[PDB]
C-alpha cells in the first residue's frame, strides 16, 4: 500500500535574520532551535511562541554550519575561518560567551556534530574528518581517505559509526573507536551535498548535484533511486521522518520535495520559499519540519 | 491569557529585535568586496592597510570590507558564499592560466549579476586588456559590467570607490526604469 497525497501548511515564520542562512539545528526537547546567518548571527528560536531567546554575535561573518548540544548547554559553529567556536548558554551570568576555540583544520569547516558534552566530530574542506576533545583541545582521531572536500556528516543513533560524504561521488562509513574506514559506497556521478542515517541505523540516504537521491544500506549496495525528468537542479539537504517512511529533500529551484522511502514516488511538495532551500530539519518527536532558505526566513510545517 | 513570565519573554524578544534593527542599520551601510587573483599578482592589501583575511578601509566618509582567502586549497564550493558582494577585485600580474581563470569566474552560475574589477598589476599593454575584455564582452549583456584598470601606487583606494559608485548608480538607474 502507498501513502498518498501529503499536504503541509506553514504554521510559523521565523523572520528576523539579516541575510541568508545555511544551517540550523533542532534541540533535544523539540522546542528550541538554532540558526546561523551570513551576517554573523546565531539566533535561538522558541518554536511554539516564535520568540527569540539568544542573539549570539559571531567573530567571522562566514559561517557554514551549526549544531546544538544534546544537553542544550552548548552551541557550536564554524566556517571559512578554520575555527570551531563553542558557546556556553547556561553560564553564571546573562551573556553567552565562547568556551572553546578549536584551530586544527586547514580547509573550510562544513559540518560539526556533538557526540557527547565533551566530544565533537568535525568535517572540513581538506578531505579529512576529525574528532576533538572540548576540555583539552586536540584531535584524538583524524579520519583519512577522502579525496575531495567533504560536504556532509551524520552520526548514528547508537553513536558507534558516522557516514561522511565528500565531493568525490563516494560515501564512507567510519569507526569512532578504531578510527579507520570500514566501508565505501560509490553510486553517484557527481559530488554529494547531504547525508542522513535511517532511524533504524542500518541505512542512509545521500543527495547529490545531479538531482538524484540515493538510498544505501550498511548489504553494501544502493537499494533505490529518487529522480524525475522535471527536476534538474542539485540537492542541498536530506532528512528522514520519525518512522522513516517519508524522505524530505532540499532543492536549488526553491521547492522542497517529499519522497516515499519504500515506493520511491513523489507524495507532496513543500513550496513556499522565496529562494533556494539550504537547510532542512526534522524534530525528534517528528511533530514538525523546519526549513531555511536564502531569503533569511525560516518556515515550520506540520 | 499570558502569565507574568510570558510578558517578559516577549519584552526580551522585542529588545532583541531592537538590537537587530540597530545592527542592520549599520550592516546596510557597508560594502563588501571579494579579492581574487593568482599567487603571482602581488596581492596591495598591505598598502591599503587563519583561512580568511579582512581589511577595513574608509574612503571619503564611506567604509568597505575587503576579504581574501589565504589558507584554502577547488574554489567551486566556497565561491557560492561570495555572491552577496558589491564587486570582485581581480588582480593579474601568467597568461592563459589567469585568462582561463577569468573566463571560468565570469561564466560562473552563482556569480551572475556581480560585476568584476580587473586590475593589471603602449601598444603592448592594450593587447592583454583587449584579451581580457573579450570574454566579458561575449557574455553577460545587461548584468555584469566589468571595469579594467592599469595599476601597480597610492591611489588604489579611489578607483574602487569610483567603480562602486558607478555600480550603485547604474543599479539605481536600472531600477527606476531610467536606463
Amino acid at each position, epitope marked *: 500500500d502507498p501513502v498518498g497525497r501529503i499536504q503541509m501548511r506553514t504554521r510559523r515564520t521565523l523572520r528576523g535574520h539579516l541575510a541568508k542562512i545555511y544551517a540550523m539545528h533542532w534541540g533535544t526537547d523539540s522546542r528550541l532551535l538554532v540558526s546561523a546567518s551570513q551576517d554573523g548571527k546565531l539566533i535561538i528560536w*522558541d518554536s511554539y511562541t516564535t*520568540n527569540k531567546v539568544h542573539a549570539i554575535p559571531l567573530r567571522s561573518s562566514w559561517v557554514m554550519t551549526c549544531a546544538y548540544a544534546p544537553s542544550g548547554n552548548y552551541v557550536a559553529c564554524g566556517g571559512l575561518d578554520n575555527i570551531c567556536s563553542i558557546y556556553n548558554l547556561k553560564t553564571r551570568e546573562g551573556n553567552v560567551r565562547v568556551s572553546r576555540e578549536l584551530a586544527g583544520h586547514t580547509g573550510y569547516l562544513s559540518c560539526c556534530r556533538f557526540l557527547d558534552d565533551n566530544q565533537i566530530v568535525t568535517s572540513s574542506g581538506d578531505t579529512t574528518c576529525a574528532l576533538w576533545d572540548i576540555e583539552t583541545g586536540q584531535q584524538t582521531t583524524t579520519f583519512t581517505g577522502h579525496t575531495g572536500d567533504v560536504m556532509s556528516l551524520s552520526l548514528a543513533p547508537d553513536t558507534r559509526l558516522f557516514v561522511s560524504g565528500a565531493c568525490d561521488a563516494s560515501a564512507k562509513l567510519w569507526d569512532v573507536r578504531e578510527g579507520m574506514c570500514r566501508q565505501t559506497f560509490t553510486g553517484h556521478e557527481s559530488d554529494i551535498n547531504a547525508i542522513c542515517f535511517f532511524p533504524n541505523g542500518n541505512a542512509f540516504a545521500t543527495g547529490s548535484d545531479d538531482a538524484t537521491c540515493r538510498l544505501f544500506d550498511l548489504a553494501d549496495q544502493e537499494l533505490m533511486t529518487y529522480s524525475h525528468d522535471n527536476i534538474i537542479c542539485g540537492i542541498t539537504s536530506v532528512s528522514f521522518s520519525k518512522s522513516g517512511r517519508l524522505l524530505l529533500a532540499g532543492y536549488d529551484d526553491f521547492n522542497c520535495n517529499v519522497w516515499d522511502a519504500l515506493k520511491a514516488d513523489r507524495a507532496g511538495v513543500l513550496a513556499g520559499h522565496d529562494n533556494r532551500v539550504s537547510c532542512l530539519g526534522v524534530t525528534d518527536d517528528g511533530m514538525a519540519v523546519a526549513t531555511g532558505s536564502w531569503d533569511s526566513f525560516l518556515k515550520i510545517w506540520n | 491569557t499570558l*502569565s*507574568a513570565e510570558d510578558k517578559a519573554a516577549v519584552e526580551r524578544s522585542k529588545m532583541i529585535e531592537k538590537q537587530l534593527q540597530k545592527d542592520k542599520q549599520v550592516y546596510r551601510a557597508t560594502h563588501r568586496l571579494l579579492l581574487l587573483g593568482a599567487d603571482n599578482s602581488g596581492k596591495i592589501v598591505k598598502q591599503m592597510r587563519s583561512g580568511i583575511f579582512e581589511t577595513k578601509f574608509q574612503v571619503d566618509k564611506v567604509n568597505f570590507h575587503m576579504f581574501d582567502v589565504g589558507a584554502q586549497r577547488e574554489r567551486r564550493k566556497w565561491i557560492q558564499c561570495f555572491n552577496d558582494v558589491t564587486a570582485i577585485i581581480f588582480v593579474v600580474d601568467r597568461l592563459q592560466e589567469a585568462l582561463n581563470d577569468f573566463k571560468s569566474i565570469w561564466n560562473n552560475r552563482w556569480l551572475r549579476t556581480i560585476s568584476v574589477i580587473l586590475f593589471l598589476n603602449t601598444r603592448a599593454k592594450y593587447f592583454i586588456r583587449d584579451e581580457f575584455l573579450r570574454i566579458s564582452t561575449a557574455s553577460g549583456d545587461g548584468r555584469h559590467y566589468c571595469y579594467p584598470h592599469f595599476t601597480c601606487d597610492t591611489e588604489n583606494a579611489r578607483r574602487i570607490f569610483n567603480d562602486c559608485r558607478d555600480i550603485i548608480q547604474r543599479m539605481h538607474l536600472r531600477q527606476y526604469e531610467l536606463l
Partner: single-chain antibody
Amino acid sequence: VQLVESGGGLVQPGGSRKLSCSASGFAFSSFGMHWVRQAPEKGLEWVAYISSGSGTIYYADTVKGRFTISRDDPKNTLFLQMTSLRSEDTAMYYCVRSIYYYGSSPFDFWGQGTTLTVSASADIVMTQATSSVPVTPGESVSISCRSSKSLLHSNGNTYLYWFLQRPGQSPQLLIYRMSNLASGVPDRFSGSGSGTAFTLTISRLEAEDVGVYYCMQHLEYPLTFGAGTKLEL
C-alpha cells in the same frame, strides 16, 4: 556576582531616603530586578519591580505612590527613593535579580540587604500548614503548603517557587516551577504538587538544613510569600 546595599539608618517620620543596590560581576543590562522587604519579626514581602530597559515598572498596592525605583545601566547601579515614610517601613531590604526566558530560573540570587529603622485588592493568599515543624536529623520531611487559587496555567507551567533562609544569610532559591532543581542545591530536596496543594520533601538532613522555608507564587503578579515554616533541630 555580588550585590551590596548603601543606605539605611534612622529617620524622622514622614521623611525621605535613598537606598542603592550596586552590582558587580554579571551582565546587569540583561536582568530585571525585584525589591524584597522583610520585617524583623515577620516574613518576606515584595515592594517594587523594574524590568530590563525600564519598560515595565510594578509596585505593590501598599506603596503604589510613595516609592520610586530607577536604575543606571552604564553605572550598573539601581536605587529607590522613598518619601513620607510611615511606621510600617522599618524592615530589611534585599535586591533580587531575575531573568525571564524559556527555561530561565528567576530569583536565582539575593543580595545582603540593608536595614531601615523608622522612629516614632484581591490577591492569592497562601497559608503554611505548620509554622514550626521540628524534625530529627537524617529523616524525611514532608512540608506542605496551600494556595487560594490554582497556580497552574493553561500552558502547563505552575510558577511555584521555594526559598530557604538560614539563620543569618539571605534566602536562596531551592525549587522553581515545582519540578526543577536549582544549580547549587543538592538532590536531597524535591517538590511536587497538583495545583492547589504543594509538598516539599527532604530525604536526609544535615547540620546546615536549619532555617525558615518560605513559599512563593508568580501567577497573578501581586505576590505574597507567607509566614513560612521554621525547621527546628
